[PDB]
Amino acid sequence: LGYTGLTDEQAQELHSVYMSGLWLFSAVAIVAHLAVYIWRPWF
Amino acid sequence: DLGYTGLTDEQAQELHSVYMSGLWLFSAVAIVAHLAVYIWRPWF
Amino acid sequence: LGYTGLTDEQAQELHSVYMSGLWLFSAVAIVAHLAVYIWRPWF
Amino acid sequence: DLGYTGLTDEQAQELHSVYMSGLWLFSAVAIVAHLAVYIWRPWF
Amino acid sequence: DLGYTGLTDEQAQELHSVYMSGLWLFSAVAIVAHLAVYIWRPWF
Amino acid sequence: MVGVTAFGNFDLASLAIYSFWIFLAGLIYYLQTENMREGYPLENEDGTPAANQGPFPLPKPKTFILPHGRGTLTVPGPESEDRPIALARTAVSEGFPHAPTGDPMKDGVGPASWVARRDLPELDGHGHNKIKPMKAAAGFHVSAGKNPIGLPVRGCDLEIAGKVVDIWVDIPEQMARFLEVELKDGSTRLLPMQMVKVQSNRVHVNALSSDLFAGIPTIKSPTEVTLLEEDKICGYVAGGLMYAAPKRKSVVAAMLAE
Amino acid sequence: ALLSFERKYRVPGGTLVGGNLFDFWVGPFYVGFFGVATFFFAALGIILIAWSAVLQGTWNPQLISVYPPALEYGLGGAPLAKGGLWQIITICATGAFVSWALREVEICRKLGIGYHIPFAFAFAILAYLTLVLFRPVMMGAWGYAFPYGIWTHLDWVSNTGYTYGNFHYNPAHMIAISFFFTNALALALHGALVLSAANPEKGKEMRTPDHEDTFFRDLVGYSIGTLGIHRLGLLLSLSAVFFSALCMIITGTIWFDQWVDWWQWWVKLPWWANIPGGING
Amino acid sequence: AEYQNIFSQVQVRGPADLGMTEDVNLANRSGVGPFSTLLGWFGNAQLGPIYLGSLGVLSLFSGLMWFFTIGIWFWYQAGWNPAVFLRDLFFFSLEPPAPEYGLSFAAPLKEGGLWLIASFFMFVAVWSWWGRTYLRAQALGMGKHTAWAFLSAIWLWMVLGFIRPILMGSWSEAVPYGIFSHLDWTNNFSLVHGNLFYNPFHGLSIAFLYGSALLFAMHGATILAVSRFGGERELEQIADRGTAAERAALFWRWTMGFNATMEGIHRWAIWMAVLVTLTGGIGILLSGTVVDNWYVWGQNHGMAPLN
Amino acid sequence: MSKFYKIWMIFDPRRVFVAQGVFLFLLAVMIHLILLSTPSYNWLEISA
Amino acid sequence: MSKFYKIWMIFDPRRVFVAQGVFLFLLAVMIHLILLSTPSYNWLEISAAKYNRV
Amino acid sequence: MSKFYKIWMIFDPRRVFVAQGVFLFLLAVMIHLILLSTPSYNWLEISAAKYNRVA
Amino acid sequence: MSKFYKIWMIFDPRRVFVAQGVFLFLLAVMIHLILLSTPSYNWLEISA
Amino acid sequence: TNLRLWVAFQMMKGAGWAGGVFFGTLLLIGFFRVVGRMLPIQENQAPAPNIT
Amino acid sequence: TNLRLWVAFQMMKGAGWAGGVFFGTLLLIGFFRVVGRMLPIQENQAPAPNIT
Ligand code: BCL
Ligand SMILES: COC(C)(C)C/C=C/C(C)=C/C=C/C(C)=C/C=C/C(C)=C/C=C/C=C(C)/C=C/C=C(\C)CC/C=C(\C)CCC=C(C)C
Ligand SMILES: COC(C)(C)C/C=C/C(C)=C/C=C/C(C)=C/C=C/C(C)=C/C=C/C=C(C)/C=C/C=C(\C)CC/C=C(\C)CCC=C(C)C
Ligand SMILES: COC(C)(C)C/C=C/C(C)=C/C=C/C(C)=C/C=C/C(C)=C/C=C/C=C(C)/C=C/C=C(\C)CC/C=C(\C)CCC=C(C)C
Ligand SMILES: COC(C)(C)C/C=C/C(C)=C/C=C/C(C)=C/C=C/C(C)=C/C=C/C=C(C)/C=C/C=C(\C)CC/C=C(\C)CCC=C(C)C
Numbered sequence A, C: 001l002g003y004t005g006l007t008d009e010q011a012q013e014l015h016s017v018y019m020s021g022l023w024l025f026s027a028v029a030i031v032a033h034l035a036v037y038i039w040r041p042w043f
Numbered sequence B, D, E: 001d002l003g004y005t006g007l008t009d010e011q012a013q014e015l016h017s018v019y020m021s022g023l024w025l026f027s028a029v030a031i032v033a034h035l036a037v038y039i040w041r042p043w044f
Numbered sequence F: 001m002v003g004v005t006a007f008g009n010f011d012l013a014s015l016a017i018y019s020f021w022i023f024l025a026g027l028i029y030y031l032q033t034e035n036m037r038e039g040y041p042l043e044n045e046d047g048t049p050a051a052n053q054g055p056f057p058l059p060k061p062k063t064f065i066l067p068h069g070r071g072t073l074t075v076p077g078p079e080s081e082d083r084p085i086a087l088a089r090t091a092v093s094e095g096f097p098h099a100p101t102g103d104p105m106k107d108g109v110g111p112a113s114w115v116a117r118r119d120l121p122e123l124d125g126h127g128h129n130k131i132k133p134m135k136a137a138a139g140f141h142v143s144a145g146k147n148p149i150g151l152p153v154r155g156c157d158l159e160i161a162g163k164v165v166d167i168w169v170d171i172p173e174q175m176a177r178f179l180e181v182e183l184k185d186g187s188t189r190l191l192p193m194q195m196v197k198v199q200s201n202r203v204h205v206n207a208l209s210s211d212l213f214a215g216i217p218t219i220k221s222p223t224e225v226t227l228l229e230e231d232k233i234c235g236y237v238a239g240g241l242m243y244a245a246p247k248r249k250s251v252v253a254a255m256l257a258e
Numbered sequence G: 001a002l003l004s005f006e007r008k009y010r011v012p013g014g015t016l017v018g019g020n021l022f023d024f025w026v027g028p029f030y031v032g033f034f035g036v037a038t039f040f041f042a043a044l045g046i047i048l049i050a051w052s053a054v055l056q057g058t059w060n061p062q063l064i065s066v067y068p069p070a071l072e073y074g075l076g077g078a079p080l081a082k083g084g085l086w087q088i089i090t091i092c093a094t095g096a097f098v099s100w101a102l103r104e105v106e107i108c109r110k111l112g113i114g115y116h117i118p119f120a121f122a123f124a125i126l127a128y129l130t131l132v133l134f135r136p137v138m139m140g141a142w143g144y145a146f147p148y149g150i151w152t153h154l155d156w157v158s159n160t161g162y163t164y165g166n167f168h169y170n171p172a173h174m175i176a177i178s179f180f181f182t183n184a185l186a187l188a189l190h191g192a193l194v195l196s197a198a199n200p201e202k203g204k205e206m207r208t209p210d211h212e213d214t215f216f217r218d219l220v221g222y223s224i225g226t227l228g229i230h231r232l233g234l235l236l237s238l239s240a241v242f243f244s245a246l247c248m249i250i251t252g253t254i255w256f257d258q259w260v261d262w263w264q265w266w267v268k269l270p271w272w273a274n275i276p277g278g279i280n281g
Numbered sequence H: 001a002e003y004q005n006i007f008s009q010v011q012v013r014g015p016a017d018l019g020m021t022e023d024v025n026l027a028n029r030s031g032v033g034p035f036s037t038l039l040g041w042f043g044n045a046q047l048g049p050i051y052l053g054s055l056g057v058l059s060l061f062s063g064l065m066w067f068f069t070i071g072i073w074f075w076y077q078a079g080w081n082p083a084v085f086l087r088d089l090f091f092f093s094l095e096p097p098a099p100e101y102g103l104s105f106a107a108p109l110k111e112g113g114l115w116l117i118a119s120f121f122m123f124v125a126v127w128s129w130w131g132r133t134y135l136r137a138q139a140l141g142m143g144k145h146t147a148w149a150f151l152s153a154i155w156l157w158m159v160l161g162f163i164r165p166i167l168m169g170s171w172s173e174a175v176p177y178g179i180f181s182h183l184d185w186t187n188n189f190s191l192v193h194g195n196l197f198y199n200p201f202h203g204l205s206i207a208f209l210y211g212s213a214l215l216f217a218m219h220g221a222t223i224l225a226v227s228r229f230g231g232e233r234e235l236e237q238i239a240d241r242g243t244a245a246e247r248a249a250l251f252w253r254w255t256m257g258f259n260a261t262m263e264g265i266h267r268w269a270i271w272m273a274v275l276v277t278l279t280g281g282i283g284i285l286l287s288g289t290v291v292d293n294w295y296v297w298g299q300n301h302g303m304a305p306l307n
Numbered sequence I, L: 001m002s003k004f005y006k007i008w009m010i011f012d013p014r015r016v017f018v019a020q021g022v023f024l025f026l027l028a029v030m031i032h033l034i035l036l037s038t039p040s041y042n043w044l045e046i047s048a
Numbered sequence J: 001m002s003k004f005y006k007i008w009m010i011f012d013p014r015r016v017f018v019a020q021g022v023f024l025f026l027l028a029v030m031i032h033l034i035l036l037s038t039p040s041y042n043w044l045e046i047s048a049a050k051y052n053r054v
Numbered sequence K: 001m002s003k004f005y006k007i008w009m010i011f012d013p014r015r016v017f018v019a020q021g022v023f024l025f026l027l028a029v030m031i032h033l034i035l036l037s038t039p040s041y042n043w044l045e046i047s048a049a050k051y052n053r054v055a
Numbered sequence M, N: 001t002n003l004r005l006w007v008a009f010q011m012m013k014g015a016g017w018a019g020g021v022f023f024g025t026l027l028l029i030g031f032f033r034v035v036g037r038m039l040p041i042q043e044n045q046a047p048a049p050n051i052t
């Protein structure tokens, strides 16, 4: 199924870059939560 | 090599390198601006 | 890369003239901000 | 030499000198008017 | 056919029709303004 | 259920108002996608698909079965101009006007543009030609207003370029569509009724000048006009508003003249 | 960013001001001289609304209210915190609206279409200028205009409406309400009819304009026609706005008492003002 | 100062169009009426024919009896005086029963009992007419868009007179049959329910009622602007996109960034008007049954400055 | 600032001058009205 | 930073200067109106109270 | 995070830069107005009380 | 009055139009000042 | 063909159009001011529609 | 080349020159009015030089 038209190899490369963006975004967020939880824990 | 915009990989790399330099310059001014505010009036 | 049709040199000349205008505009702003800060500081 | 308006470089220089001369004349009269009002009613 | 200004008879007729049209338009607006004031403040 | 709140201030009225925002958001999405069955996908100023297509995806295609056995029309579908566009790029950067390479009124570009419609006359519900001349129309006659037939045709340059001969009538709607203006060369052109102003004694065509009347595209058959011929005629006359501004003697035209 | 057919219509000319100075497209939008004024007045108006929220001390978008100057200031300037901002926004709103209409005029000339759309929009602007400019000036106070709030400009409507009792009895209002109801009735009928003729029962052919006239002739015995209904749509909307502008410009300027009191003239006609029986006497 | 196509500058009068005959029983269809020159300036001049079937008859009989019953009560309120009848025509009213009777049919004939009879006739009249719109579309093989566009109107009409009174358990909540009375009923409705302006659904209906005027002014002007290209023939533009459809598309694309089609604009048209009454029915239905004061409801939902 | 003349090869001169005339007049109108708005600097009032 | 001239290889100068001209004048008008609104930095008000213009 | 340059193969540089310019300005304007609303961090009000401009 | 057009063969048209513009403006100024001179018809005073 | 006059003429052209539009707007505002003064607004005038 | 505009342009040309001269004269009168107000004339001012 090729609705988008890109190949699986292009899909793999896009996914690898996309997850790198996701893990970078998540990593900042985890550090962001750690600082806030230390400053003002919500539990 | 999806090439939706028609840029080649070399063009993308050069465009990104200039774009990141602009971003780091923008971030650098912001970090100084936040230091000035935090020194003058910390919010933590 | 070409979008606006300007050559590399034409962009460099265009940017240099533009930057000259930017610093001239910035200089008046810095003079204006000093004048206001002296007259009435906001810090 | 972008030529978006078709004017040669010489015509641009001549027109700009005309425009700047009027700008400084307009600036000078405005300065006099601001001096007159500040004498009449200062705003600082 | 005195020709003091050099305009032909046809040009005089065309110009006069233009001038009269503006005159009646100017007259009409003045009449409206006079009606408005006389309603607001009659002078008789 | 007066004042009955499930939680906080949220109640049955609050339930309904939020549920409508969801419905309205969904409805606006549905309406917008339907509007995307024509003119899409987007294209660059050269003719290639653009990198940007919009936040709303294209809808699933639907098929219109045309009347009178004209075929079917499935949209969204591959749409082509099917005519050479005589325009020249005025700037490499996009979002800038394209200037005509030659005479724009003859080249069918800008306000004088036209579309390659089907080169067939438009039919009524009974299969007959919708637009026919009043002479060939059965029983049709002028019922009210000034009859334009026989009146001189004055262009935007205040010069008479012919007289009206016949009126073309939309047979179902029973309203006039075209004026058949005979020129000085013996040929008759068609003028849309929307672009003429039948005055007391003359037909004033503000769109076209006297010299441009001869340039109106002609019809292949005197008894009927196809959709393609309508577009060329309607495009040409309406293109005259901007492309005959130098030839117009109006005061406002002079003020807005370049 | 161009439609499959947009290219052949993108040609210079038709501009009212600026020539080719601003004759370019930003994405799908055409800029023009008046679009630059449009964007500036739009952006400036929006920011001052946001800044007015700061001064008011609230951030809830529904509670944001740019009140006009109080009645004591009359038709003069006011402090920005207590009415002055509203005057600047109203000037920005007036500038944005008229620039938008004139920008549409440039697009009309570039496409060679009629100026019905900007003329239709100008009716809305004069309706807008009636409430914020024409009515307050006659009444001699900016405070009679309405605040720029989502739910506070409804308070203005309710308060102004109840100043004159039940506002329904405004005769110009009754005309405009009948037009607004008629226009929505026409739009639902017109929209539904074309869709019914264009999206018929499955398998059946797309219908023709004759079926549209046949349907409404079988329904109510009269079809106004494809040209007529769009003429009707334009005139119904403009008449509704024209009478709505009229209804307010006479309220508080020519009529001051309850609008129900106005209707007693018909009851007090000379030939039946004194006949016993009925509702009135 | 040119021809704006607002009024036809010439009229042509051919033979009367008898209309299509897909599945319409021509026996139930009447003959062609007169040709109105006054109507011809704006639209078509021909009046008729009109189809009259079973639901057409039921619609007319109930519609006439509804109209007749209001008229007889209007005469009784006038004392059978034609002069009084014309003097107090707008001030006449067929009021619903008193609040004491609730939903009971025990109201005296002159104290609300007659209104129940007149309301029944209107109820049958309108519902029979809705089926008539449905069946006329089905007969010609068209879509049921009118039938469901009408059902939006019925929803508000049902709510005001039938559904909301049942929930409130009183016929006194319904609408009186009169010109000024149903205006007074409207005003009294808001005042009792605490400034109906702060009804969220009433605000939405005004949005779509304003929008319907906005969209029809936009749409009507657009087609008249592109009528010089034969844009008024919208069905052919849907079938075969001419230059009018493209210019109409481009005008709004260059004006407000987005546009529609010749067929998709009418989807906006139908939904813009349908939501007028659709949101209206919910807005009235909630009032009293769920919210006894909208301004207090507005305060607790961050729509009013207090609380 | 020795190459600011080149801006006239970017923007057409006559178009800018008309637009600048509009801008300068409206700006002059803008400032004068603000001065009249303030109770002071209102020359039409303090004179009387 | 020395490669920032390439922004003109992407953006046409005509549209940018129009966009920039609007942006700066919009920004300048924005700040002046903010200062005027506040009781402090309303230089028209400051002089009036300083020089007893009331 | 090394192949992020390929975002320009997906996104048109012209549209993003306009979108980013609008985004950054509106984001910056939003944050400044948020600070001005609060009595603290409204530097305009802060300096007035610090140097006693109220009188 | 069917031959009043011939006055444009006596007096040059453009010269007269400029002079007439001066005359009309000054006459308009003349009348307005006289109205302001009278205690009534002085719109700048009766309003306040 | 004087360049100084040509530039000044263009700027005066724009200033005149802005002047006419602004003066025309004041004319409408003044007209409604006059009509409101003529009508008996001050004798009986409505209270404030919105909280000051 | 529009005759109606050409005639109106000439009359506007004359009206503008008369307008500038009249506005310039008012500027001088206003200037001396301002200077006299600034100077302490009202505090001590001379009696009438001529019999009223
Ligand atoms: C003081 C008065 C109150 C108020 C009280 C109400 C009340 C009460 C109601 C409305 C309703 C409406 N109000 Mg409100 N409203 C006020 C202020 C406003 C203002 C304003 C600027 O101030 C506006 C624009 C509106 C606007 C509107 C409409 C959006 C809405 C009605 C839609 C419609 O078409 O109904 C009219 C159409 C119908 C009722 C449908 C009729 C359909 C049937 C099928 C027709 C049958 C025909 C019959 C057989 C006759 C045939 C005759 C023959 C053909 C000859 N209101 C104030 C706050 N308003 C209604 C609503 O829905 O609110 C949510 C409503 O019930
Ligand atoms: C009211 O409720 C509250 C708000 C209180 C609580 C909230 C509840 C909810 C509903 C929370 C929901 C949370 C969710 C759904 C979070 C999801 C987060 C995700 C999935 C985030 C994803 C982030 C990913 C990022 C930022 C990725 C970035 C990618 C890049 C920078 C690289 C892009 C470039 C590429 C791919 C190059 C293309 C490659 C080729 C080969 C061409
Ligand atoms: C309401 O919530 C509050 C406001 C309280 C809290 C806010 C929360 C949120 C949601 C905050 C969000 C923050 C975000 C998303 C910040 C993101 C910032 C970013 C990513 C900024 C980007 C900056 C980049 C810049 C300035 C780049 C500049 C680049 C240049 C000037 C050079 C351009 C030239 C090029 C690329 C040359 C082209 C090359 C060739 C070869 C032609
Ligand atoms: C909430 O609001 C407040 C105010 C409280 C807070 C707001 C904060 C924010 C969002 C502030 C925003 C600040 C920013 C982003 C300001 C931007 C400043 C910049 C970048 C200004 C740029 C100025 C540049 C100028 C004036 C350039 C002038 C150039 C010329 C005059 C020469 C042009 C001519 C050329 C290039 C000719 C070349 C042609 C050839 C053929 C070579
Ligand atoms: C928020 O608003 C308030 C009022 C609170 C504060 C406002 C703030 C802002 C944002 C102010 C904005 C200021 C700006 C952007 C000012 C810009 C001024 C400029 C650059 C003006 C340029 C003027 C140039 C002129 C007038 C050039 C004229 C040239 C000629 C006429 C050609 C030369 C010919 C001559 C001299 C001969 C003329 C002929 C005769 C017969 C006299």
Ligand SMILES: COC(C)(C)C/C=C/C(C)=C/C=C/C(C)=C/C=C/C(C)=C/C=C/C=C(C)/C=C/C=C(\C)CC/C=C(\C)CCC=C(C)C
Pocket: E018, E019, E020, E021, E022, E023, E025, E026, L024, L027, L030, L031, L034, N004, N005, N007, N008, N011
């Ligand atoms: C002692 O003074 C007091 C005040 C007490 C009493 C005064 C008494 C006296 C002596 C009064 C004297 C009155 C006189 C002599 C009045 C004379 C009036 C006349 C004959 C005026 C003629 C006006 C003619 C005009 C304005 C003609 C205009 C023509 C055109 C502009 C050309 C046509 C073009 C048109 C209409 C298009 C214009 C273009 C646009 C865009 C609007």
Ligand SMILES: COC(C)(C)C/C=C/C(C)=C/C=C/C(C)=C/C=C/C(C)=C/C=C\C=C(C)\C=C\C=C(/C)CC/C=C(\C)CCC=C(C)C
Pocket: H067, H068, H070, H071, H072, H074, H116, H117, H119, H120, H122, H123, H157, H158, H159, H160, H161, H162, H175, H176, H177, H178, H179, H182
């Ligand atoms: C001389 O004139 C003659 C006598 C010849 C004829 C003239 C007649 C006249 C003057 C008629 C006037 C009619 C008027 C003024 C009609 C006005 C109607 C208005 C303004 C109505 C407005 C709203 C009405 C609504 C919303 C009604 C809704 C009704 C329903 C939803 C039906 C409810 C159904 C019920 C109660 C069924 C109850 C019965 C049973 C058996 C369960």
Ligand SMILES: [Fe+2]
Pocket: G190, G194, G230, H219, H223, H234, H266
């Ligand atoms: Fe339509």
